[PDB]
């Protein structure tokens, strides 16, 4: 292993900017589901706690508060090539979220719906700030249930809901993979209350256990 | 119409545009921005804050006890308390503080930086020490006859139990060529004993030290990349409860 | 004005009469607005401004050139070499003044010329260059294929960078006054030569008699030294 | 062979600027990997001593600062016909490179990926000017390693970085080779201290060396 | 919203195009523009920076042997020294120049041009010579006699060891018809010995030449091609390196 | 012409746009507003009767 070293000639303090140093657009969610007509379709609750890259950069702080910029990158591998039309319906808090490939609330108009193509670019939509406090509480010291014996750490108010993704086409006679990648790049970001870097390696997506 | 023809790259969905795109929910009011404490508008002000080193640095010092350098009457008259190798990138005592885990998001990071040594022995604890700041491409003193001969600061902790120790301008970056290149050297902070350590016949024989390490406000980082301090390799326990 | 009088060193000679600003720059010291470059930067005086001549090479007819790598020539060298030693930055210009002391029966023509970078290859094979093969010091090297600069580019468009020709009919001298050329503000010593004092004679030396061992002297002053600076105040 | 004459009627030295000398999109890597899911994948170092007509023209300087706009031009060739996605992510120096096409590091939310199709325009993204330098030194006389025995004429500074380029695309029943041409134009180019064009054919892209 | 139609070349990546892309590293600082000597601003600018010709211009003559005309004894009364074709295209003694190199990046090319003859040999060395631009259309002088009846300088080296030698205008192209259709010619540069080469007892019996080329400023270029001098043809060494 | 790339997001049915599309019946004109009594301007209006 070599030892070199270069005169380091930097000019400013733009590119340490929060606002700058968290919007990356960074994959936040992928899995694969196998079509034919969960039953066969993707949904996820959107959180940020699915890698530890963007995990661990955004536990550097304690609120934050970012419109989430979601782009839907959807491939497709058959087990002829179809064309084929995806339906990424976003499902805030409180709206039912579907169990079955052909429920009744894929057709919710309430629901932020987005069809597209996988012919098409990628889906992208900018959901907006929805905690109901006026920051997400990335580590939120307290409980949901009023001093019930359930789950620490979860904010009621921090839910962006759960990203619902299937496919508008009826029964094919192929069969096929389709994996949903999900692309997050926070914007217009505020931050507050800096915390130390996390050294361990987690435990869970559920809180902050460490193991040493 | 308007005449418009695809450029290449037309369709691409690129990490790092700044496009703005369709709101899922147009027409939806966010919840109002609350004034709270302590905003950070720009991650250098995070590298500016004090943070401890480890500075005790034997493989031995298993956890807390590498914050610390015990000195006590088995440091004999000079001695090599520490040296703290100024690479912030490398393992070391700079490897885990705010100025090393910030500055692990960025390849390229140059700037001043600023040593506080705190002495936690009691109130009659007498002594000396010299904190030598040797400079990149210097070789790092062995005895404490060399450690005064370059950069250095007797430190006699009377009343005076604190060091602000500025640092000129510790750089340095990652390397690649046609991986295995880092940062040569960018010099060290090296502590000798002066004198013998002088405790009375009530306190403690053995008396430690505190290291702290900031960044002045000519310190910067460019191009941005991730950090690998953290890393999944088998999996997160009910990483699949976010999906069912 | 030039005047070859740097620091305790000095060159009486009587015919110079003239100088090549390299590529029409001065050389000075680091500018104000770079910063960057740490925060101390000693800047020597005529300790090391001051020149540094080499041993005499023996130009004969049978000769194809001589190369001085700068500042690898002057790193083993009195106060320019204790302090490459010691310091891991500096940022030098240099004043060279070539002569090529001869009589008017002598006949040749040396292409004094400076080349900024000059990466050399090795010849028929793909190993590149080795730390002793690039890295020579004091005594320089010798061109093994002149003609294509030991890099495999032609000696014939070499004049494209700072040269002067010591014609022996006409001038038997020649100063190229380098600045600081690299990309970097300041640079690595010990590991990295921004100029190259090449001197490569086109025409030969002739002369009816035995082969004349007429001397190419070279004289390297490192003008406007920085360095790092070691003598830093820590509060 | 006839020898003609014409009378050269001119006006203008701006096509013989630098500017307009070098910024011409040059063809400067292009290899093929055959795909069934290096591990079926394409990566490349970005520099420009790939091909001898790049190479020459840009030996011309000792000095360059320019935005490498790269452009890559993907083409398919099965061994039905499907459709891709791409990810030609750009790893910069000090971001890990990836070994297979389902490593950890594509979903890297610092690098710069960029994911595109093959029905698509081809893909282009101006890599701005990342020597640490000010210029990238063309000829580096002088040694990464100080004073070690490794490689001579390798400036620390001038590493653009990997250019990795995979198909997003889980397994297909089809194998098929994809050929991964990239185009880079040089832009606002300067250039400083120019040299003698080479007359002896290269030997490596290592280095300067000459056969005679 | 905007009703735009797709153009025919929609799409198309033309390679000459000068359309801006979206950065890949946006909101990354460079490093900043550092003053480097030596800016190149234009190619003509090394164009018209002198440069050696190949006068020897004989088949035995290998390598650095052909910079220089020796001229002694041998050279009886009137002899051609050299010829020096004008066709910067083909292979002569303007061809591995830097007014021929970078003219062969362009197909067409127009200007004048200014050669500098510097004699080597000793100071005691006198001797003339009679230095005859032919025109283009005309023919090449083969005797002394027909050489001074055109465009000629006759150059007695006494102290006067340099020659400016202004040539008008030497254009040309390539061409192609329905390829061995070069430039025809634009003209000759050729010396002829006026006198003997006087040398004194001591000096050297063999004197040389070295002659220059350069272009003024009215020289131009355009139709930028790529230049034939290098080409690959089997292999570059680790060339899979930049891949593996 | 104009020098227009694809952004991410193209071709897709948001079925929260507010895009105006190309009129089915143009220059047909509709029938002219009547002033009918109780316009409900804001839905919590509707919640403030008892």
Same mark, same amino acid.
């Given at each position: 292993?070599?030892?070199?070293? #270069? !005169?380091?000639?930097?000019?400013?303090?733009?590119? /340490? @900017?929060?606002?700058? =140093?968290?919007?990356?657009? %960074? *994959?936040?969610?992928?899995?694969?589901?196998?079509?034919?007509?969960?039953?066969?379709?993707?949904?996820?609750?959107?959180?940020?706690?699915?890698?530890?890259?963007?995990?661990?950069?955004?536990?550097?702080?304690?609120?934050?508060?970012?419109?989430?910029?979601?782009?839907?990158?959807? #491939? !497709?591998?058959?087990?002829?090539?179809?064309?084929? /039309? @995806?339906?990424?319906? =976003?499902?805030?808090?409180? %709206? *039912?979220?579907?169990?079955?490939?052909?429920?009744?609330?894929?057709?919710?108009?309430?629901?932020?719906?987005?069809?597209?193509?996988?012919?098409?670019?990628?889906?992208?939509?900018?959901?907006?700030?929805?905690?109901?406090?006026?920051?997400?509480?990335?580590?939120?010291?307290?409980?949901?249930?009023?001093?019930?014996?359930?789950?620490?750490?979860?904010?009621?108010?921090?839910?962006?809901?759960?990203?619902?993704?299937?496919?508008?086409?009826?029964?094919?006679?192929?069969?096929?993979?389709?994996?949903?990648?999900?692309?997050?790049?926070?914007?217009?970001?505020?931050?507050?209350?800096?915390?130390?870097?996390?050294?361990?390696?987690?435990?869970?997506?559920?809180?902050?256990?460490?193991?040493? | 119409?308007?005449?418009?023809?695809?450029?290449?790259?037309?369709?691409?969905?690129?990490?790092?545009?700044?496009?703005?795109?369709?709101?899922?929910?147009?027409?939806?009011?966010?919840?109002?921005?609350?004034?709270?404490?302590?905003?950070?508008?720009?991650?250098?002000?995070?590298?500016?804050?004090?943070?401890?080193?480890?500075?005790?640095?034997?493989?031995?010092?298993?956890?807390?006890?590498?914050?610390?350098?015990?000195?006590?009457?088995?440091?004999?008259?000079?001695?090599?308390?520490?040296?703290?190798?100024?690479?912030?990138?490398?393992?070391?005592?700079?490897?885990?503080?705010?100025?090393?885990?910030?500055?692990?998001?960025?390849?390229?990071?140059?700037?001043?930086?600023?040593?506080?040594?705190?002495?936690?022995?009691?109130?009659?604890?007498?002594?000396?020490?010299?904190?030598?700041?040797?400079?990149?491409?210097?070789?790092?003193?062995?005895?404490?006859?060399?450690?005064?001969?370059?950069?250095?600061?007797?430190?006699?902790?009377?009343?005076?139990?604190?060091?602000?120790?500025?640092?000129?301008?510790?750089?340095?970056?990652?390397?690649?060529?046609?991986?295995?290149?880092?940062?040569?050297?960018?010099?060290?902070?090296?502590?000798?004993?002066?004198?013998?350590?002088?405790?009375?016949?009530?306190?403690?024989?053995?008396?430690?030290?505190?290291?702290?390490?900031?960044?002045?406000?000519?310190?910067?980082?460019?191009?941005?990349?991730?950090?690998?301090?953290?890393?999944?390799?088998?999996?997160?326990?009910?990483?699949?409860?976010?999906?069912? | 004005?030039?005047?070859?009088?740097?620091?305790?060193?000095?060159?009486?000679?009587?015919?110079?009469?003239?100088?090549?600003?390299?590529?029409?720059?001065?050389?000075?010291?680091?500018?104000?607005?770079?910063?960057?470059?740490?925060?101390?930067?000693?800047?020597?005086?005529?300790?090391?401004?001051?020149?540094?001549?080499?041993?005499?090479?023996?130009?004969?007819?049978?000769?194809?050139?001589?190369?001085?790598?700068?500042?690898?020539?002057?790193?083993?060298?009195?106060?320019?070499?204790?302090?490459?030693?010691?310091?891991?930055?500096?940022?030098?210009?240099?004043?060279?003044?070539?002569?090529?002391?001869?009589?008017?029966?002598?006949?040749?023509?040396?292409?004094?010329?400076?080349?900024?970078?000059?990466?050399?290859?090795?010849?028929?094979?793909?190993?590149?260059?080795?730390?002793?093969?690039?890295?020579?010091?004091?005594?320089?090297?010798?061109?093994?294929?002149?003609?294509?600069?030991?890099?495999?580019?032609?000696?014939?468009?070499?004049?494209?960078?700072?040269?002067?020709?010591?014609?022996?009919?006409?001038?038997?001298?020649?100063?190229?006054?380098?600045?600081?050329?690299?990309?970097?503000?300041?640079?690595?010593?010990?590991?990295?030569?921004?100029?190259?004092?090449?001197?490569?004679?086109?025409?030969?030396?002739?002369?009816?008699?035995?082969?004349?061992?007429?001397?190419?002297?070279?004289?390297?002053?490192?003008?406007?030294?920085?360095?790092?600076?070691?003598?830093?105040?820590?509060?």
């Amino acid at each position: 292993a070599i030892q070199t070293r #270069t !005169v380091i000639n930097q000019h400013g303090v733009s590119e /340490t @900017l929060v606002e700058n =140093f968290l919007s990356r657009a %960074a *994959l936040v969610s992928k899995r694969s589901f196998e079509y034919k007509d969960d039953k066969n379709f993707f949904k996820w609750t959107i959180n940020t706690r699915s890698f530890v890259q963007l995990r661990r950069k955004l536990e550097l702080f304690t609120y934050l508060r970012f419109d989430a910029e979601i782009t839907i990158l959807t #491939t !497709v591998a058959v087990n002829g090539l179809p064309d084929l /039309t @995806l339906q990424a319906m =976003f499902v805030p808090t409180g %709206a *039912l979220t579907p169990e079955k490939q052909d429920s009744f609330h894929w057709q919710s108009g309430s629901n932020a719906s987005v069809f597209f193509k996988i012919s098409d670019p990628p889906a992208r939509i900018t959901i907006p700030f929805m905690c109901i406090n006026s920051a997400y509480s990335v580590f939120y010291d307290g409980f949901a249930g009023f001093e019930k014996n359930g789950l620490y750490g979860i904010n009621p108010a921090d839910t962006i809901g759960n990203l619902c993704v299937r496919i508008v086409n009826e029964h094919q006679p192929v069969g096929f993979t389709v994996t949903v990648r999900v692309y997050m790049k926070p914007k217009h970001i505020k931050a507050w209350a800096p915390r130390p870097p996390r050294t361990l390696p987690y435990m869970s997506i559920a809180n902050a256990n460490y193991k040493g | 119409g308007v005449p418009t023809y695809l450029l290449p790259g037309s369709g691409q969905f690129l990490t790092t545009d700044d496009h703005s795109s369709a709101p899922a929910l147009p027409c939806f009011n966010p919840t109002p921005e609350m004034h709270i404490p302590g905003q950070v508008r720009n991650m250098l002000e995070v590298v500016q804050v004090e943070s401890m080193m480890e500075i005790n640095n034997t493989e031995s010092a298993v956890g807390m006890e590498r914050l610390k350098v015990d000195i006590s009457a088995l440091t004999d008259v000079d001695q090599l308390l520490f040296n703290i190798p100024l690479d912030i990138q490398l393992d070391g005592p700079l490897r885990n503080t705010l100025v090393g885990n910030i500055s692990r998001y960025y390849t390229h990071w140059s700037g001043s930086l600023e040593m506080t040594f705190m002495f936690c022995g009691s109130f009659m604890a007498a002594g000396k020490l010299i904190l030598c700041y040797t400079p990149p491409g210097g070789s790092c003193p062995t005895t404490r006859e060399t450690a005064m001969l370059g950069t250095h600061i007797v430190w006699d902790f009377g009343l005076q139990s604190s060091v602000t120790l500025i640092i000129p301008w510790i750089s340095g970056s990652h390397y690649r060529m046609f991986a295995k290149s880092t940062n040569a050297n960018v010099g060290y902070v090296t502590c000798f004993m002066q004198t013998n350590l002088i405790v009375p016949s009530e306190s403690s024989d053995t008396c430690s030290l505190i290291g702290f390490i900031a960044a002045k406000d000519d310190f910067s980082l460019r191009l941005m990349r991730d950090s690998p301090d953290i890393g999944q390799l088998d999996h997160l326990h009910a990483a699949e409860a976010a999906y069912q | 004005v030039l005047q070859l009088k740097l620091g305790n060193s000095a060159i009486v000679t009587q015919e110079a009469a003239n100088y090549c600003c390299a590529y029409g720059e001065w050389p000075n010291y680091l500018p104000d607005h770079e910063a960057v470059a740490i925060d101390k930067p000693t800047q020597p005086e005529t300790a090391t401004d001051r020149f540094y001549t080499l041993k005499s090479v023996k130009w004969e007819t049978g000769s194809t050139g001589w190369w001085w790598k700068l500042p690898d020539a002057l790193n083993n060298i009195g106060m320019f070499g204790q302090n490459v030693q010691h310091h891991y930055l500096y940022r030098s210009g240099f004043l060279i003044h070539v002569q090529c002391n001869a009589t008017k029966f002598h006949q040749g023509a040396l292409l004094v010329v400076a080349i900024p970078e000059h990466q050399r290859g090795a010849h028929n094979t793909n190993t590149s260059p080795g730390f002793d093969d690039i890295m020579k010091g004091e005594e320089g090297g010798t061109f093994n294929h002149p003609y294509v600069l030991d890099d495999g580019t032609s000696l014939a468009c070499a004049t494209i960078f700072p040269h002067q020709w010591i014609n022996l009919r006409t001038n038997n001298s020649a100063t190229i006054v380098l600045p600081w050329m690299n990309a970097a503000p300041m640079d690595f010593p010990l590991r990295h030569n921004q100029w190259t004092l090449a001197i490569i004679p086109v025409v030969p030396l002739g002369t009816r008699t035995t082969s004349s061992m007429v001397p190419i002297t070279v004289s390297i002053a490192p003008m406007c030294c920085e360095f790092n600076g070691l003598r830093h105040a820590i509060t």
